[PDB]
Write a structure and sequence with these properties.
With about 160 residues, the protein is an alpha+beta fold. The chain has one domain: Roll (Ubiquitin Conjugating Enzyme), CATH 3.10.110.10. β1 and β2 form a beta hairpin. The protein has a four-stranded antiparallel β-sheet with strand order 1-2-3-4. The longest helix is centred in the last third of the chain and has 20 residues. Bound molecules: ligand U94. The ligand COCC(=O)N[C@@H](Cc1ccc(-c2cc(Cl)cc(Cl)c2)cc1)[C@H](O)[C@@H](O)C(=O)O binds next to α2 and α4. This is Ubiquitin-conjugating enzyme E2 R1. It comes from Homo sapiens. GO terms for molecular function: ATP binding; ubiquitin conjugating enzyme activity; ubiquitin-protein transferase activity.
Length: about 160
């Protein structure tokens, strides 16, 4: 039996018993231990509030000696998230056999809340964000886009029977 199996079943249980705030973790519908659904809710008092965003963790067979891959399925406009959904996360500071899903999920919240415009993944989002912060949020173009995606997700919430 793969060492990964037991490490993932334990990590799944830990996260369903003590969730990271805003995240809800399950397997995909076919029950593949190695492919997790991640449901992410925008927190109150942010432009993401009321959001329902979906992402995926794909784990290798040798986890935790190699890192999972993380990808948004929801389209997202952010200096650090690619067109594809892939994400800008160093720890994927670098990966260790002692890092774990809980740390990955917190480093997503950290990428979310504080964009790095130094090495952007989405260069137009990145320059549009610097301009937004420059204006001390007086300029509405970046938050217009986020607001639209957030409202869009209410369709996904409804298709999935969630629960915002
Ligand atoms: C442009 O929109 C930017 C935005 O709303 N930023 C927020 C940071 C922030 C906080 C939380 C998240 C966040 C957290 C989780 Cl757990 C899920 C999601 Cl979808 C977003 C992202 C950014 C705020 O500026 C921040 O100061 C606050 O109100 O806490």
């Amino acid at each position: 039996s793969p060492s990964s199996q037991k490490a993932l079943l334990l990590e799944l249980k830990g996260l369903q018993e003590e969730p990271v705030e805003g995240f809800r973790v399950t397997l995909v519908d076919e029950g593949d231990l190695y492919n997790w659904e991640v449901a992410i809710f925008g927190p109150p008092n942010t432009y993401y509030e009321g959001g329902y965003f979906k992402a995926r963790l794909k784990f290798p067979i040798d986890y935790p000696y190699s890192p999972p891959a993380f990808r948004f399925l929801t389209k997202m406009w952010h200096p650090n998230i690619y067109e594809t959904g892939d994400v800008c996360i160093s720890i994927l500071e670098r990966w260790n056999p002692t890092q774990n899903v809980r740390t990955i999920l917190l480093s997503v919240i950290s990428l979310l809340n504080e964009p790095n415009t130094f090495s952007p993944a989405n260069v137009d989002a990145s320059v549009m964000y610097r301009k937004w912060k420059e204006s001390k949020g007086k300029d509405r173009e970046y938050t217009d886009i986020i607001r639209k995606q957030v409202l869009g997700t209410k369709v996904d919430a409804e298709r999935d029977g969630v629960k915002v």
